[PDB]
Each structure stands twice: as C-alpha cells, then as structure tokens.
Amino acid sequence: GSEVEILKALLELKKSTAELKRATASLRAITEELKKNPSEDALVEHNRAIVEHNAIIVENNRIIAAVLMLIVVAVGMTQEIKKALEELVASTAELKRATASLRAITEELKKNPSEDALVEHNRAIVEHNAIIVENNRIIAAVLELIVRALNLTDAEVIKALIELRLSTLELVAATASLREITEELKKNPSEDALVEHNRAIVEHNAIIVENNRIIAAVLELIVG
Amino acid sequence: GSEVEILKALLELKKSTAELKRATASLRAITEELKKNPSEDALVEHNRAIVEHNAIIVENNRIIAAVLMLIVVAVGMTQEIKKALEELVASTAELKRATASLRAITEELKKNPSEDALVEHNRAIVEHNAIIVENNRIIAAVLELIVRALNLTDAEVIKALIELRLSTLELVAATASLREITEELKKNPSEDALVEHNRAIVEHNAIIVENNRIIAAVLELIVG
Amino acid sequence: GSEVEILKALLELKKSTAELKRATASLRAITEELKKNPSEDALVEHNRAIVEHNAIIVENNRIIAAVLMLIVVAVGMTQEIKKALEELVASTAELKRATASLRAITEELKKNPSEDALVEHNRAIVEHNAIIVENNRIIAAVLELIVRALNLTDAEVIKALIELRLSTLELVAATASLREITEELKKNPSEDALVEHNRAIVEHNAIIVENNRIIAAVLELIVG
Amino acid sequence: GSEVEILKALLELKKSTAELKRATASLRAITEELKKNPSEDALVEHNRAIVEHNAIIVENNRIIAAVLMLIVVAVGMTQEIKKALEELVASTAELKRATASLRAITEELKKNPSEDALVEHNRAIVEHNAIIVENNRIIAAVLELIVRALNLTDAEVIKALIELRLSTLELVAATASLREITEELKKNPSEDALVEHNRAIVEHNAIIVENNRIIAAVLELIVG
C-alpha cells in the first residue's frame, strides 16, 4: 500500500525540484538575453508567462504532496488499527459471554437463592468489571491510533487524551483493589466484609462511569 | 489493506450487536424478576450498573466503527492516488523537458535570430501550453481524489470543485482554439496572423491564470 | 456537441470583453470632451445613456455565459452517462435472469425437495446477492454522475453520497464474506453450517436494505 | 449525443419492466407454493427478501430514468443554444462597432462641431438603439432556451418571462416609432423637430431601461 505510494511521492518531489531548477534557469536566461534588445517583445513576454506558470505548478506540487503525505500516514496505520480491532472484537465477545453468564446466574439466584448463587453473582460481577477494564484499555488505545491517524492537533482532544490516560490509571488501580477485596471476602465471608465489598463495587462503578465519560468526550471531539 | 480491516469492522458490528441483544435480555430479566422482591438490593443494583456499562460500550463501539470507516474509505483509494501521482510525475517531467527546450531555443534565437528560431519558439510555446493543460487536468483529478479520500463536506470546497471543473472546460476549449490558430499561422505566416496568434496566446495565458487561481483556492480550502 | 457550444461561449466572452473596453473608452472620451462645454446637453446625455446600456449588456452577457457553462458541463457527461446506463441495463437483465432461475428452482424444490435442489437454491441466492451488489455499485456511480452533471451543492446530498460510499464498502465486504461462507458450507455441508449460513444471509440482507435506504435518500434529494 | 442516450434509457425501461414482470411471477409462485408447507422457512424467507430487493431496484430504476430524461432534454437543445449564442456574439460585435463609431463621432463633433457631425451623431444613436433592440430580442430568446433546458417550473420565472415578452413588444413598437421620428427629422430638420426627437430618445431609453430591468430579474431568478 503506502510503501509504493510514498515512493511515488518522493519521485514527484524529485521531478518538481528538477523542474524548479530548470524553470529558474530559464527565468535568468530570459532576463539576461532579452534585456539586450527589448524590441523582441513576444519572446520576453511569452517566456515570462512560462516562468510564472512553472512557478505556480511547483508550488501546487508542493502543497499536493504535503496533503497526500497525510493520507499516506493514515494508510500506514492499517495494521495497527486492524490489531486494535481484533482486540476490541475479542473483548466485546468476552463481555457478551460475561453478560449471558450473569443473566443465567440472576435467574438461578432468584429462583433458588442458595448462598452459592450469591457467591457466583459476586464472581460474575468481578469478571464483568475486569472485562470492562480491558475493553476501556483497548478503546483508549484505538482512540490514540485514530487521533494519530487523522493527524489531529486540537488542544481539546490532546487534553481529553491526557485525562483519559489518567483515568485509565485510576481505573486499573481501582480494579486491582476490587479484585483483592473480593478475594478477601471469599476467604472470610461475613456481613461486614460483604458490605465493605459492596461499597468497593459502588466506588468502582463510579470510576468506570467517569472513565466512560472521558471516552465519550474524546469521541465527541473526534466526530465533531 | 482495507480488505481485512473492513472485514474486522463488520465482525465488530456483529459482536456488538450480539452484546446489545444479550444486555437487553438481562435488562428485562432483571426488571421483571427483581420487582418480585426489592429487598435483593445488591443483585438489582449490580445488574443495573452492568446494563448501563454495556449500553455505553455498545454506543462507543458504534461510534468507533463509524470513524474507522472513514479511515478505511481513505485507505481504499491508495491505488487511485498512486496512479494519479504517476500521471502527475510524468507530467512534471514533460513540463521540465519543455522548459529546457524552450530555454535552449531562446538562447539560439537571441544568438542567431533566424526566422526558423522564431517558428521553433512558437512551437515550443504551444507544446508548453498543452503540457500545462494536461498537468491541470491531472491535478483536478487528484484534488477530487483528495476531497473524496478525506470525506470533506464543506460547501466551500464543493463549490470550488465545481468552479474548477468549469474552468477546466474553458481551458480545454481555449487550448484547442490556440492549437488551431497556431496551425493556421504555420500554414500561412504573416504579420497579421502573427499578431492574432500573439493575442490568442495572451488570452490563453489569462485562462491558465484563472485556472491556477481556482486550483489554489481549492488547495487553500483543503489545507485550511 | 459541447465542443462547439463551448467554443462559441469563448467567442462570446472575447466579444463582450472588446465591447466593455470600447464602451469604457467612450465613457471617458465623453467625460473629458463634454466637460469642456456642458451646454452640449443632448450629446452628453445621449452618450451617457449609451454607456449605461452597454454596461448592462456586458453584465448580462457574463451572466448568460455563466449559466450556459452549467448546461455545457451537464452536456459533456453524455458518454459517461451512456456507459453507466449500458452497465445498468446489463445488470437489470442479469438480475431478471437470476430471478427467473430462482423461481424455477423454487418450483422444482417444492415439487421434488431433493437435497440437490436445496443446494441449487442457496447457489441461486448467492448469485442474486452478487447481482444486487453490482447493481448498487452501478447505481452509486450513476448517482455520482448525476450529482456532478447537475452541479449540486446541497450539503444534504453531499453527505448522502458519503454515506452511500461507506455503505457500498460495507456491502462489498459483506458480500465477499457471504460468498466465502457459502463455499465453506458447500465443502462441508451440515446442520450447523447451514444455520450459520442462513444467519449470514439474514445479516447480508439487512445490509442490502440499509444500502437501498441510502440510495433512496439520494434519489429523493435529487428529485426533490 | 442524446439520440443514443435516450435509446439506452428506453432499453433500460424495457429491461426493468421485464424484471418487474418476473419478480411478480415469483412473488405469486412463492406465496401459493410455500403456503402448502410453511416449515420450509429458509426458502420462503429468502425468496421474499429476493422479491423485496427486486421491487426496490425497479422503483430506483424508474426514478433514475426520470432524472436522466431531464439531462437528456437539456442535451437535446445543444444546437438551439449554439445558434442563440452565435446570434448573441454577432449582436455584441455589432454593438461594439456602433460604440466605436459613436466615440469617433463624438470626438469629431466636439473638435469640429459641424452640423453634419450632429446629424451623424443622431444617426449613430438610432443605429445603437436598433442594436440594443436586437440584442435584447436575442437575450430573451436565449433566456427562454435556458428556462426550457433547465426544466424550470418556478411560477416567478414564468411570470418574469411573460413580463419580458410584453416589454419586448413595447420595446419593438417604441423602436419603430423612434426610427420614423428620426426619418421625419432628417427630412425636415428644425428646432421643434429636434426637441421632439430628443424627447422620443428619452422615452426610448426609459423603455430600454425597463426591458433591462426585466431581463435582470429573469437572470436573477435563473441563477438563484
């Protein structure tokens, strides 16, 4: 793909440079030879027009190449985006499996409220949060790939990406804390440990909500 | 390149759709089963949070896919752009050759102002204008490819492209008229035919200037 | 066709320009000669009226040429449209043949439900979808030709065309995926492969429906 | 040009009609044969999707042909427009010659105010008005050609054209009256005849101004 397109852009720069050098040489040959006898009006006026036309063409070639380099840089990220998508697809499928599992657990817990079903409920919630964390990590990575691929410079998007990175650090640390709390609850289940675990979950969900808010802000800036 | 990236985007849409269907099924199973006994607070609150998280993830996947499709469409034009560049490079090289030829003719005409050298001058000028016309046709084509590749909707760029197309029609018709006038001058050279030819050249150059102005306006709109 | 009409428009521009230059020259000759003796009222008032009349005529010629250039640009696409129509006609005829084949297969399959008839049914469905994809590609191309020929600038039509291009990319990728799934079913037919294939068909039809919706929106915008 | 494009549109209508007939035949064969055994779900659902796809394609072909017929009708007027332009160009050139003649007369009359120069002045003014009348007749004709070529239905443009036709009748009658007055002045020149002639000129110019106002209104409606 871009391996050849870029080689052609380089060939274009070489040819427009050679054109510029030759057009400049005629510019000067014209001034020096025609000033000798201004009565040769057609020759000097035609050659000056030729020089202006070439100068414009060279400037246009420079601008066109400058734009195509942006298309080329977007093209060169095809494999990075493809891999980010493969990860996002696997994450989505895992999230779906966790949701179906949780639904089945909910039905079993309500129909037959065995303590084991409550344990399975909390386990499913922890798996779901781990999946959300992986999903948001993958999305943040794909957002960075999109921002880079589109060559965005908007200060608002850069700041939003910084906020996203910080919120993903907070989300990962909170996730690790939630997993440790769940394991401690499992080892020594109790009413106090269970209420502390439920509080840890509420705080974790609040963090996820903030992370999703930031992701939404980044997407809004990219789309709009 | 885009052949696989797009297949992955379609796979993502399939998976986010399956996730949405499953998240919806749990949304309803939760509401209907939990209203039976609101005292199971942890189960209903955790599952509602789960549903909100999935709904957000599905919406984000939709938006991300929508953006990546714009990158994919830009990527899919790689071969069209490569061919447009090959044409532009060949045109640039031909323009350079015409310029070098004209410079050599100018030097020969000034050093030895034979009538044959004036004839060669007018021939070189006509070849140069034919080259500009081919060059601007190629640039207009690459500009359309750029506008399509970047998915631009700005009304100003669309109008500028329309003006460009019209000016390229005017330029081609004027070029054909100039070639016919040159052939008539060559067949029956005279002072009156020569002055009419020089006027034809001035009008042609004015048309080229307008065509380049429009191209510059289009590039300004694309870059800025 | 347009080759001569445009040459005439250029001749008109040349003549209205010469008229403008001469009308301006009399404008000034009038001011300078008549201010010498304002008592020559009839001469100055008549010549001023003459100048205003010419200025109006020059402006009208400019506007008329500007409109006719839009008619000329629409005319110049005659061969591109003719070729797009030839493709659309061939596509329509092929779609008809596929439909008649499918009808005959349906009758044979219901009258004698041999497994081979089911295989032929799925083959006919795949051919039909391939035909729809070619038909919609051709229509999208003719829509672009119509939009360009009519010099439309409506932001809504430009956006609809962008959506169309993206949906045609999705449609082509889905079609390739459907063909591959059908080939895999043919090589290893089974109940699970057959149900997966039928699901692939349902998803493909949903994509076709969306592509047709976008095409309909574009046609609505062109007609209305 | 349009001779072939229109034949292709007719071929398209023939082929889309045949498609419609076959799609309808399968629609009915499907309903009647499948109701015999609704358990053949894949066959009935696939064929119903096939029928919907064909119905949509047929409606789209009808709409596309309806638009292309408007392009074809615009194309078919190429020779009428070309001839209107040839007339407008000849009119412009004649107007330029009259203007240059009037300028030379003005210079001669001011430099050497011979009675013969005043006679030539009034003659040149009458010729100029005759030229304006021919120019506006030609413009009104080209406006009618443009309105027909663009298939405009706007009530405002139709009314403006009616007003134009009426004003051109007034302009022609006034022109004939001015010519008769000029001939009477020439045969029996006098101060009273000269002042009556000058009044006739003022009234004629007022009529020309109104005719140009209407033409401008028509152009405004066509462009906007």
Author numbering:
A (entry chain C), B (entry chain E), C (entry chain Z), D (entry chain L): 1 to 224
Publication excerpt:
Here we describe the de novo design of pH-responsive protein filaments built from subunits containing six or nine buried histidine residues that assemble into micrometre-scale, well-ordered fibres at neutral pH. We then applied the filament design method described in Shen et al. to dock these connected monomers into a wide variety of helical filament arrangements and design the amino acid residues at the newly formed interfaces to drive assembly.
All 18 designs were well expressed and soluble. Two designs (DpHF7 and DpHF18) were found to form filaments, as seen in negative stain electron microscopy (EM) images. We used cryogenic EM (cryo-EM) to determine the structures of DpHF7 and DpHF18 at high resolution. The resulting overall architecture can be viewed as a right-handed helix composed of two identical, parallel strands with contacting subunits. In contrast with the near-perfect agreement of the DpHF19 design model and the cryo-EM structure, the structure of DpHF7 differs considerably from the corresponding design model. The pH transition is thus reversible, and the pH transition midpoint can be increased by increasing the number of buried histidines. DpHF7 also has a reversible pH response, with disassembly at pH 4 and reassembly at pH 8.
